[PDB]
């Protein structure tokens, strides 16, 4: 099975502080898209809210004619929508280009491939959802050492098209199902080869 990457779009809803950390381009395309011959699979769309301190200035006046400005940190709420995708081969189309898969982890979970909140050596962490990191690499000769076969993603709203169109929330063939994250009550899982 070939892995065409993941990506994540973002739209600011109040403030403009969040999409910097929420948006994630696809390594393979330079954009929020899938390589030719791959299909975007929409895993999830949700809004992230966050409290932050914004610097603001305000004028206090005595009799509207003697005025002074003061600037302070003020507590505000930032909100933004993220829309999460992964890329799956619709057909065999042109090969062998695709990404090596090196596990996933969050700020509060651990990556079974490396047993650390990290990716294997030479791998890039890509942002997905609010805090998931997806470990990815492009160099087969150094990556395959640290790569596990990848069997797809699926979520509470979207099945896994690699199962063998019907989109079943399942893992294909000889792959085992593992929980990635629960994002605002929505389950997101991934599939890897049977193993510890
Ligand atoms: Cl949802």
Author numbering: 376 to 539, 548 to 579
Paper text:
We determined structures of the P2 domain in isolation by x-ray crystallography in two crystal forms, with two crystallographically distinct copies in space group P21 at 2.05 Å and eight copies in space group P1 at 3.17 Å. The resolution of the peripheral P2 domain is relatively low in the cryo–electron microscopy (cryo-EM) structure, and in particular, an extended β-hairpin region was not well resolved. However, by determining a structure of the P2 domain in isolation by x-ray crystallography (at 2.05 Å resolution), we were able to build an atomic model for the whole complex into the cryo-EM map. Liposomes containing phosphatidylcholine (PC) and phosphatidylethanolamine (PE) showed no sedimentation of the P2 domain. When adding to these base lipids increasing concentrations of phosphatidylserine (PS) from 5 to 30%, the binding efficiency was gradually enhanced. Given that negatively charged lipids such as cardiolipin, Escherichia coli total lipid extracts, and LPS from E. coli and Salmonella enterica are characteristic of major bacterial membrane lipid species, we also tested and confirmed preferential binding of the P2 domain to these lipids. In contrast, the P2 domain showed almost no binding to liposomes containing sphingomyelin, which is a neutrally charged lipid found in animal cell membranes. Truncating the β hairpin (residues Y427-V452) within the P2 domain (P2Δhairpin mutant) abolished its binding to PS, cardiolipin, and E. coli lipids, confirming the role of this region in membrane binding by PFN2. Thus, membrane binding seems to be conferred exclusively by the tip region of the P2 domain β hairpin.
Perforin-2 (MPEG1) is thought to enable the killing of invading microbes engulfed by macrophages and other phagocytes, forming pores in their membranes. Perforin-2 (PFN2) has recently been identified as a novel and critically important component of innate immunity conserved throughout the animal kingdom and evolutionarily close to the last common ancestor of the MAC and perforin-1 (7, 10). Because of the presence of a canonical MAC-perforin (MACPF) domain, PFN2 has been proposed to form functional pores in bacterial membranes, leading to bacterial death and control of infection. However, unlike MAC components and perforin-1, PFN2 is initially synthesized as a type I transmembrane protein and found associated with the membranes of intracellular vesicles in which its large ectodomain (consisting mainly of the MACPF domain and a unique P2 domain characteristic of PFN2) projects into the lumen.
